[PDB]
Design a protein around this ligand. Structure first.
Ligand SMILES: *[C@@H]1O[C@H](CO)[C@@H](O)[C@H](O)[C@H]1NC(C)=O
Ligand SMILES: *[C@@H]1O[C@H](CO)[C@@H](O)[C@H](O)[C@H]1NC(C)=O
Ligand SMILES: O=C(O)CCC(=O)C(=O)O
Ligand SMILES: O=C(O)CCC(=O)C(=O)O
Ligand SMILES: [Fe+2]
Ligand SMILES: [Fe+2]
Lengths: 219, 219
């Protein structure tokens, strides 16, 4: 079965041919990082930086999302939320409306779980996520977020476009540690707990346009 | 109204006469530690050490606990748990048996809450807890625990007697930082997240008997 009603219908082949899917899409530095020869960085305590996605994932994903185009979100209330009251709103496209959510849960189950289990010894996961979306920061649509906290055990944060060549801005800002992340990488991911210890704030974009993928796993 | 069918009935006066209850039982230095002129210590990353209970409350609580006698617990399976299986058993007296549950929840709601809201800015608590007990460590019946995690946002650890004078043992040992807590004080408290980034293990006791008090707040 190979449906062709997509710009890149190959992206749906995660179930059918997982090995070639990983070969094409997953960043080539992932396996070496997982087996433990460095690569991963700890810019701040209890924060880790390991590369996950290759450029093809990034460009094809932004292509698909821009093909959808419908940039909902921004209002403090919500209908996608059962409670109907977002703590902070963002202009977002959730994976539920695109139909890609199941593949994303499969990706989180297979290629992120082991990384966290090896990074935090003694922690056991099943990689359950309910809220997952891609956020766009534009200097005119929406500024960066206010300081807040995340309703999940830890949050997976992945960039989607190259800083400088397309946009200029900043990354995260950890208040309690005076930590600033200033140069996000295109193919890397950020892992940090977001319930109690880490009060984080978003740095403001100045020129260009940036895309960020965020997921809440283990709520 | 006054119930005199207790060894120390004044312990149950946290609802009628809050001010005198606080003046007699709560450690005197609590207010100073709350308003922020030191005292509160951070021996290891994201762990805190501030005084909560004075000597009178500790001694009376210990005596009232030992009066009950039935130091149950020890089997891997459980009857006090809805699921019916402990991950790790320890000799404990759940407060629900002795009736002190409501007053303990009141104490957590009144005194701990503001203190933990001050320590971690941007966090809002309701001090709702389900698991709360007192564990007796003894070199004869049960030594210390295997390394593990906790099923709560953060845990409160309070000692109930003096080190060296009545027991010789050890505190906690944090695996991911190589942190050792050498000398617990009598009435002080220990706060630390207990789900993701604190893989802690308790040291074993060799001489005499020691008491600690735990509460898994914010399930
Ligand atoms: C993968 O890591 C190696 C380490 O030497 C590096 O040479 C290579 O450029 C990396 N691949 C990338 C960044 O796509
Ligand atoms: C409370 O702190 C003061 C600090 O000046 C100290 O003098 C006093 O002994 C403390 N109370 C105790 C340890 O019970
Ligand atoms: O959109 C969100 O609320 C999560 C993203 C966030 O706060 C962050 O990127 O740190
Ligand atoms: O037995 C337990 O789980 C409570 C005791 C504990 O975790 C500790 O001693 O730190
Ligand atoms: Fe966040
Ligand atoms: Fe514990």
């Amino acid at each position: 079965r190979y449906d062709t009603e997509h710009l890149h219908p190959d992206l749906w082949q995660i179930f059918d041919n997982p090995v070639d899917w990983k070969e094409q899409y997953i960043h080539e530095n992932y396996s070496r990082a997982l087996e433990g020869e460095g690569i991963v960085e700890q810019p701040c305590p209890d924060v880790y930086w390991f590369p996950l996605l290759s450029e093809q994932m990034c460009d094809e994903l932004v292509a698909e999302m821009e093909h959808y185009g419908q940039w909902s979100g921004g209002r403090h209330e919500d209908s996608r939320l059962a409670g109907g009251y977002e703590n902070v709103p963002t202009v977002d496209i959730h994976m539920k409306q695109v139909g890609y959510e199941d593949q994303w849960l499969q990706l989180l189950r297979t290629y992120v779980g082991p990384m966290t289990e090896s990074l935090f010894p003694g922690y056991h996961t099943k990689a359950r996520a309910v809220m997952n979306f891609v956020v766009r920061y534009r200097p005119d649509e929406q500024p960066s977020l206010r300081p807040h906290h995340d309703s999940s055990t830890f949050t997976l944060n992945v960039a989607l476009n190259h800083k400088g060549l397309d946009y200029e801005g900043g990354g995260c800002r950890f208040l309690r540690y005076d930590c600033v992340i200033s140069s996000p990488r295109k193919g890397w991911a950020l892992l940090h707990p977001g319930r109690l210890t880490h009060y984080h704030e978003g740095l403001p974009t100045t020129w260009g346009t940036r895309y960020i993928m965020v997921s809440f796993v283990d709520p």
